[PDB]
């Protein structure tokens, strides 16, 4: 029996085919002359990022110049950005222009890099920003979409405005129950066990593992938390913490077999309690509720992880939920 999402299972079934059939998307291009590059903001594997301006309004934007890319892949990101445009803490696609090739125009966000920000984040900042990120995840999941590349680099945080935006939807996909996906998604350190053991019928829960990796890195001040030197080593790094008994049960449940070369690397390991990662430098960020929350994200079995909605309801976010009401 194929694995299926515990939540939002049927969202794309009841949608018109036009909603998820991104491959048939007719892109309505603007014109490049409407937007102008000001300063380079960053480099990427698929694109170059620039801080730019709308010439016909002096309005500042982010310009993402997509490098070489297939027609199918460009339409997937554009269609998904359009489908999600307006949701909480989702980056907003303003326009799509081209010379060929393309170029995506987004709203501007004055982001601070996580390598500078996270070491200064307080216990409350972490609870606050993770909660904001969960808003984004619950929304895109409820719209039948998995992000599949959750990581600090794709979470833009304006620390003075205390805004958060989930960006780079280039690896996102539509969730269709029963579908086998590519496991070569996400970024190494944030890859869920499903991608490392070749479980292809995964779902939204993949994003919750990635979140857990981010979360562990923040509260334990350990970046990245799971530091594998390749995809096989990535599993080993996880097994040395979660332990191999839980790994074996998970493989058994989904009738998975590790190839012998990977099996030799994984070996045998006892579970390392989350408390073993507490030290003098990070102790102010760790509490019984933070550990319980993290422990419910970082499970081998994707079905056993908290959903975005369940995560928002966790006691770790009690103060943030109450402080938000007003």
From Swiss-Prot:
Subunit structure of this chain's protein: Heterotetramer of two catalytic alpha subunits and two regulatory beta subunits.
One record GO biological process: regulation of circadian rhythm
Disruption phenotype: No visible phenotype under normal growth conditions, but the triple mutant cka1, cka2 and cka3 show altered circadian rhythms and delayed flowering under long day conditions.
Parent-record interval covered: 77 to 404 of 409
Entry's family note: Belongs to the protein kinase superfamily. Ser/Thr protein kinase family. CK2 subfamily.
Subcellular location: Nucleus; Nucleus, Nucleolus
Function: Casein kinases are operationally defined by their preferential utilization of acidic proteins such as caseins as substrates. Phosphorylates casein in vitro. The alpha chain contains the catalytic site. The tetrameric holoenzyme CK2, composed of two alpha and two beta subunits, phosphorylates the transcription factor GBFl, resulting in stimulation of its DNA binding activity. CK2 phosphorylates the transcription factor PIF1 after an exposure to light, resulting in a proteasome-dependent degradation of PIF1 and promotion of photomorphogenesis. CK2 phosphorylates translation initiation factors.
Membrane-crossing segments per the record: none
EC assignment: 2.7.11.1
Name recorded for this polypeptide: Casein kinase II subunit alpha-1
Glycan attachment positions: 110
Activity regulation statement: Inhibited by heparin.
Highest taxon above the source species: Eukaryota
Catalytic reaction equation(s): L-seryl-[protein] + ATP = O-phospho-L-seryl-[protein] + ADP + H(+); L-threonyl-[protein] + ATP = O-phospho-L-threonyl-[protein] + ADP + H(+)
Tissue: Seems to be present in all plant organs. But seems to be less expressed than CKA2.
GO molecular function: ATP binding; kinase activity; protein serine kinase activity; protein serine/threonine kinase activity
Domain (Protein kinase): residue spans on this chain: 35-317
Catalytic site positions: 149
GO-annotated cellular components: nucleolus; nucleus; protein kinase CK2 complex
GN (gene name): CKA1
Binding positions for ATP per the UniProt entry: 41-49, 64
């Amino acid at each position: 029996m194929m694995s299926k999402a515990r939540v939002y299972t049927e969202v794309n079934v009841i949608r018109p085919k036009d909603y998820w059939d991104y491959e048939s998307l007719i892109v309505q291009w603007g014109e490049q002359d409407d937007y102008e590059v000001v300063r380079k903001v960053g480099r990427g594997k698929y694109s170059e990022v620039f801080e730019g301006i709308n010439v016909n309004s002096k309005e500042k934007c982010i310009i993402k110049i997509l490098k070489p890319v297939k027609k199918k892949k460009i339409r997937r990101e554009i269609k998904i950005l359009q489908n999600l445009c307006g949701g909480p803490n989702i980056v907003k696609l303003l326009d799509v222009v081209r010379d060929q090739t393309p170029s995506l125009i987004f709203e501007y966000v004055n982001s601070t890099d996580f390598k500078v920000l996270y070491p200064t984040l307080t216990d409350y900042d972490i609870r606050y920003y993770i909660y904001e990120l969960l808003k984004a995840l619950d929304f895109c999941h409820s719209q039948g979409i998995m992000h599949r590349d959750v990581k600090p680099h794709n979470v833009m945080i304006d620390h003075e405005l205390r805004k958060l935006r989930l960006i780079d939807w280039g690896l996102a996909e539509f969730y269709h129950p029963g579908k086998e996906y590519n496991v070569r998604v996400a970024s190494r350190y944030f890859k869920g066990p499903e991608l490392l053991v070749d479980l292809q019928d995964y779902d939204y829960s993949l994003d919750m593992w990635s979140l857990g990796c981010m979360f562990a890195g923040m509260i334990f001040r350990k970046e990245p938390f799971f530091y594998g030197h390749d995809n096989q080593d990535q599993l080993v790094k996880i097994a040395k913490v979660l332990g191999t008994d839980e790994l074996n049960a998970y493989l058994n449940k989904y009738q998975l077999e590790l190839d012998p070369q990977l099996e030799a690397l994984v070996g045998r390991h006892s579970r390392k309690p989350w408390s073993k990662f507490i030290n003098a430098d990070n102790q102010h960020l760790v509490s019984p509720e933070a550990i319980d929350f993290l422990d419910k994200l970082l499970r081998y079995d994707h079905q056993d992880r908290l959903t975005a909605k369940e995560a928002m309801a966790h006691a770790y976010f009690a103060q943030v939920r109450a402080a938000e009401t007003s």
